[PDB]
Amino acid sequence: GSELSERIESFVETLKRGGGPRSSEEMARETLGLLRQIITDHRWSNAGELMELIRREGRRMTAAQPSETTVGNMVRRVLKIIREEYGRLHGRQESLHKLLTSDFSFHYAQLQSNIIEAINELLVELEGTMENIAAQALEHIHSNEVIMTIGFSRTVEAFLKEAARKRKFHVIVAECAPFCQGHEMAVNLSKAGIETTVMTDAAIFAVMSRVNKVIIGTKTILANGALRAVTGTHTLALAAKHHSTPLIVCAPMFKLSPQFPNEEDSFHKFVAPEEVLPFTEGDILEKVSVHCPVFDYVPPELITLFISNIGGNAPSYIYRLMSELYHPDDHVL
Amino acid sequence: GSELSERIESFVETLKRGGGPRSSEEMARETLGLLRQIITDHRWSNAGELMELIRREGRRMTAAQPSETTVGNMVRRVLKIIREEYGRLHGRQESLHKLLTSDFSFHYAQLQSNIIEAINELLVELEGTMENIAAQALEHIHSNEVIMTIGFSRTVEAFLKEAARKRKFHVIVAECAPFCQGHEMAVNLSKAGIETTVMTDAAIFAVMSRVNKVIIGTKTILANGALRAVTGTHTLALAAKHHSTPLIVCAPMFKLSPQFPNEEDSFHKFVAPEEVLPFTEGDILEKVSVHCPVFDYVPPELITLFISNIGGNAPSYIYRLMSELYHPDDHVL
Numbered sequence A, B: 001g002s003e004l005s006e007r008i009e010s011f012v013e014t015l016k017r018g019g020g021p022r023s024s025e026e027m028a029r030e031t032l033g034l035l036r037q038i039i040t041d042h043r044w045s046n047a048g049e050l051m052e053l054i055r056r057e058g059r060r061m062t063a064a065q066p067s068e069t070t071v072g073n074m075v076r077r078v079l080k081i082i083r084e085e086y087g088r089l090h091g092r093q094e095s096l097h098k099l100l101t102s103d104f105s106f107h108y109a110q111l112q113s114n115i116i117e118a119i120n121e122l123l124v125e126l127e128g129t130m131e132n133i134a135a136q137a138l139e140h141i142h143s144n145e146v147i148m149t150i151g152f153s154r155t156v157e158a159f160l161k162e163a164a165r166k167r168k169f170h171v172i173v174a175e176c177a178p179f180c181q182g183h184e185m186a187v188n189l190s191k192a193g194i195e196t197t198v199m200t201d202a203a204i205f206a207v208m209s210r211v212n213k214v215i216i217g218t219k220t221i222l223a224n225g226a227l228r229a230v231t232g233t234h235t236l237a238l239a240a241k242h243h244s245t246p247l248i249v250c251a252p253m254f255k256l257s258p259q260f261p262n263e264e265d266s267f268h269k270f271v272a273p274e275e276v277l278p279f280t281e282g283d284i285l286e287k288v289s290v291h292c293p294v295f296d297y298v299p300p301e302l303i304t305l306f307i308s309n310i311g312g313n314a315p316s317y318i319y320r321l322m323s324e325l326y327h328p329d330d331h332v333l
Helices: A002-017 A024-041 A047-064 A069-090 A096-101 A111-127 A129-134 A154-163 A182-191 A201-208 A233-242 A315-325 B002-016 B024-041 B047-064 B069-090 B096-101 B111-127 B129-134 B154-163 B182-191 B201-210 B233-242 B315-325
Strands: A146-150 A170-174 A195-199 A213-216 A227-230 A247-250 A295-298 A305-308 A311-313 B146-150 B170-174 B195-199 B213-216 B227-230 B247-250 B295-298 B305-308 B311-313
Touching (some): A024 A111, A047 A069, A069 A315, A146 A154, A146 A233, A154 A213, A170 A201, A233 A247, A233 A295, A311 A315, B002 B024, B024 B069, B069 B315, B146 B201, B154 B213, B201 B233, B213 B233, B227 B233, B233 B295
Parallel strands (some): A170 A195, A213 A247, A247 A305
Antiparallel strands (some): B227 B295
C-alpha cells in the first residue's frame, strides 16, 4: 500500500527528472519488479481489474517520460503474459486464416502464482541477455576487421570485449556530441586491449570508406524495423548505406516497441540548449533558436541485421517478433 | 617504296594474325614510326594528297584488326598534327562561338620538316608516359590500403611498384580467365615485396566489401568516357559501384579513341572456343555454342577517375581531351 505507492511515486519522479538507472537492463528489471509488487500487493478479483490497473500504471509511467520506451515495453510484456496465463487457465493474432475461421470476468485462485512465476522466468531470461548476445560475437567479426561505433553502448562493449578474446580488430568510436559518451567507450575498449580510435561525428562519412561494418546499439526498435537511436545515428546509417557497409544493431528483445513512426515531435528528446550553446554567449542568445534533440529516427531500409538474445534476424522479420511479444490491443495502452 | 610497302604489309599481317607488340606503348611507337616512314618516302605535292594516303593506309590498318584502337589513334593524331601544321603555316572545332561568328591543297615546301618534328616530339612524349603516370602513385595510395586489380596491366604494375617504395599495402589480383594473366601480375608484385593475393573472377564481388579502391588498366577510352577493357572488368566496376568503391583507370593518353559506343558486335574480340571449352569434350561440342569474348564495355558512369600522363580527370571531361587530340572530320577516317 504505502510502500507500493511511494515506490511508484519515486519511480515516476526519477523518470520525469532523469538520472536514476543508467543501464537499460536495470530499468527493465526495476520496471518488472515494480509490476510484480503491484500484482502481489494491489487487490483485484478477476483479470479485468488487473488489466485496468496495470494499464493505468503503465500510462502514468509512459506519460512521465515517453522517450523511455523500456518501461512501456515491459508493461505491455506483463499484460501479454497475464493474457496468455488467463487464456491457458480459462480457455483453450489477426490473420487471413483467423478471419476465415474465427471475457476476463471469471476468477481463478492459482492465476496469480502462475503470473508471478512467468514474471520471474522473464526476469531470469533478462538477466543473461548480455552474455547471450555477446556469445555471437565470433560469428560476425573476422580477423583484422574494422568496426565503427557511435556513443557508449554496453551491449556493443560486451560484444567487442568477447570478440577480442580470440581475434584482433580495430574499433573506431565516434563521440556522440554534445554528451561525448564515446570517450568512455573508447578508453574502456583500450583498457581491454583493443586498438581504438576516437573521432568526432563530423568525420563519420569521411572514414566510412575504410570501415568494414558498423555495430551500434539503440534505445528503441519500432514495429517496422525502424530505430530510435542516439542523435547522429541517422547520418551514420546513411553513410553506411552509401558504401553498402553492413550495419548491425545489437539490441536486446526488451527494446522492441509496438509503436510506429507516425508519432511526431515526441520522438526526439529535447534538452537544455546549454549543451549546444553555452549561457555565456550573451545577448545573441536572445534572438537565436537553439535545439538539442537527443534521439534520431533511422528508417528500416538502412539496417542490415538485428542481433538479440534469440539470435540474428532481418528487419523485414521484426513484425513477427512484435507479434510474439505484444497483443495487438495493448499498443494503445 | 618497296621496303616501305613490305613493312606495311608485315605490320598488317602481324595485326591480322594476332600477337606482335605485347605492350600497347610498343605498338603505338611502331605505328608512329611507320607513319613517319610513309610521310618521308611517299611523294605528295600538297597536304590534301598526304591526308588521303594517310587515311588510306589508316583504313587498311584499322581493318586489319578493329579491336586494336591504338593504330587508328596514332593515324588520327598524325592527321591532326598535319592539320595544325598546315593551318599555322598557311592560315590562322564546332562551337556556339564559331557558329555565331563563322581549304587544303596549297603546296608550301616547308610542311614536311614541321610534321616530322611534331611526330618526333609526340614520340618523346610517348616514351615517358609510364613514369609520368607512376609518379602520381603516392597521391592516391595511403598506409595499409587494400587495392584490387584484374588481369595484367603494366601501367598499374608500375603504379603499385612505385607506391610500394614508401607505403605498405595489400593487393588482391583477380585472374582474367581464361588467359589467367593475373597470376603473372601477382607473382611480379610479390617479387617487389608487396603482400598479394591470387583469386578467381567469381570471388570479385565476394571481396569488394574489404577493398578500399580499385585500380585497373584499359584497352581503349571512348569519346564519352567509356572503356574497352578485359572481360570481367564490367562486373568488377559494377561491384565497385555497389560499394561506392572508387575505381581508378590508369591509362595513357594514346588510348583515347574518338569513336562512340554506338558500334556493336565488333567491339569485343571473339577468339577460338578452345580457351573456354577444350576440344577433348567430344560429341557435345556439336550442339553447344560457346563464345569467348576478350573485351568488355564499361559505361562512363562506373569510372571515378582517369589518371594519365597529364594528371587526373573525371570522365565528364574526356570529351574536351578528345577535342584536343583529334579533328572531328577524322572520326570516320
